[PDB]
Amino acid sequence: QGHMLRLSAPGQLDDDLCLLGDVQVPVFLLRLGEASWALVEGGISRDAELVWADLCRWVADPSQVHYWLITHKHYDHCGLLPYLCPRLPNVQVLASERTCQAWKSESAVRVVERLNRQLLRAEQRLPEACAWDALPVRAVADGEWLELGPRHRLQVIEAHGHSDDHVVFYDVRRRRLFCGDALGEFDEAEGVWRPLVFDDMEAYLESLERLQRLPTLLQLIPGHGGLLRGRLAADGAESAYTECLRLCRRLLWRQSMGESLDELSEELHRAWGGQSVDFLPGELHLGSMRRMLEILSRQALPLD
């Protein structure tokens, strides 16, 4: 519990929730019952032996892990599946059909494996891994109700925009939203959202629009940074919408002065990249900045 507005420490977060591993790339644990548990977010590969450790503190039996929820396909939210699913015999991976099929596509999983193989610690020893198409997956659809436990009824909501497959999970009983990256990267130093539009801006903004409509949130849990609460989590969606349009204004103004995409990409990198050095090679962060600026220049409404 606490007076704080952001909980950002491994360990228990609420009466049913725990944060496992590194707060940067956390994995969330839900206690559905006395002998039933579920996971959320797939984290990165190199934390496999850390998460596991943390996990075993809370669960007496790994066979009591019955569900694992995954927001999307990007390397940084599914890299633990091949390594730890072999130790969770009773687990269903739950992802969107686009995300499910990504794991079948050779090229996609190669990008995943590469980016996740690049974030090891000098002499890190990866454990054995199973195939991506061998995972125990069940595809979910927009609006499906996941009866995980008696007092855990989560709804799936399509949140395309960040990627062509992103989905989020709404625990309506506790007004808790696992939102992954659909809102962006929370700026720990300023308290505002950093837009992460890596596929389509119209869909990203329409998804944030739809998430604004939800009941007032008490807990807002993105893919990076921990759990937000209070008034920070209530207007999270509107704030992400606002910051995305603010960046659109910035880009359009800079281009009306004659700047190139790469220039603003370098500026944004200078000001943001410092947060994600531990789990994102700087060059991929700069490339993602360039890609987002591309999409914004394409779909942003001109000023005439």
Binding site: E202, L205, E206, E209, R210, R213, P215, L245, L301
Partner: protein
């Protein structure tokens, strides 16, 4: 488009999206798209004609559960539905509320049973004495005040443009009764609805009384009417005179 950068932008984008449409189904599809974009699950569009005065036809089309349509029309709940009848008395939108339905408890209970637990209804009168109504509905979220205002505006724009396009496409639900009067017959009916007899009309129009009575007979034939009173009353109710 319909997007983000301001309300006027969404307005113009909606108009441009609806201009090329030459099929009513696509019009309703665009309307449903925007309704869900607003945040609701189902919608409905109703047209209340003024006649027959005893049982005025109230035609409906929407996306409520089909079983609810079966029940609604089977027991003709459409006659004394408060959401529609408010439009006869007010130009303001009506947010669904228990107090509003104090007079029609059965209808409200059954609608709640079908998930139509929250909703709102906007009326507007077409320039031809028709009462058109646009309703939206969802299941679990109550309408907050700020969202009430937002809705009111967006629904007004949407229903205005919808009625415009459906008039341009001559939908059967709005066509009511296709009746055209000639200039002579229309002015004769104008005089008759002002109380003039056959002879006074014959004098004023400088024609014979036999001609005037035959024009009356034709007019009756068009309205499927047995006398002049029905013709005059229905023409006044339909805005033809």
């Amino acid at each position: 488009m319909r997007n983000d950068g301001g309300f006027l932008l969404w307005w113009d984008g909606l108009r441009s999206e609806m201009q090329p449409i030459h099929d009513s189904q696509g019009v309703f599809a665009v309307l449903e798209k925007e309704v869900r974009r607003l945040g609701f699950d189902y919608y409905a569009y109703g047209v209340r004609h003024t006649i027959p005065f005893t049982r005025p036809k109230t035609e409906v089309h929407g996306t409520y559960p089909k079983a609810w349509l079966e029940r609604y029309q089977m027991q003709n709940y459409g006659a004394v539905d408060p959401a529609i009848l408010n439009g006869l008395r007010s130009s303001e939108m009506v947010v669904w509320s228990d107090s509003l339905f104090d007079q029609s408890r059965m209808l409200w209970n059954e609608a709640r049973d079908w998930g139509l637990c929250v909703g709102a209804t906007l009326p507007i009168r077409a320039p031809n004495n028709l009462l058109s109504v646009l309703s939206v509905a969802r299941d679990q979220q109550n309408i907050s005040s700020f969202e009430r205002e937002e809705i009111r505006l967006r629904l007004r724009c949407m229903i205005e443009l919808l009625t415009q396009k459906l008039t341009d496409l001559e939908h059967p639900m709005l066509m009511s009764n296709p009746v055209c009067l000639s200039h002579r017959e229309r002015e004769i009916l104008q005089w008759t609805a002002d109380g003039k007899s056959s002879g006074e009309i014959a004098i004023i129009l400088s024609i014979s009384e036999s001609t005037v009575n035959f024009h009356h007979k034709n007019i009756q034939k068009k309205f499927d009417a047995p006398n002049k009173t029905l013709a005059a009353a229905y023409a006044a109710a339909l805005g033809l005179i």
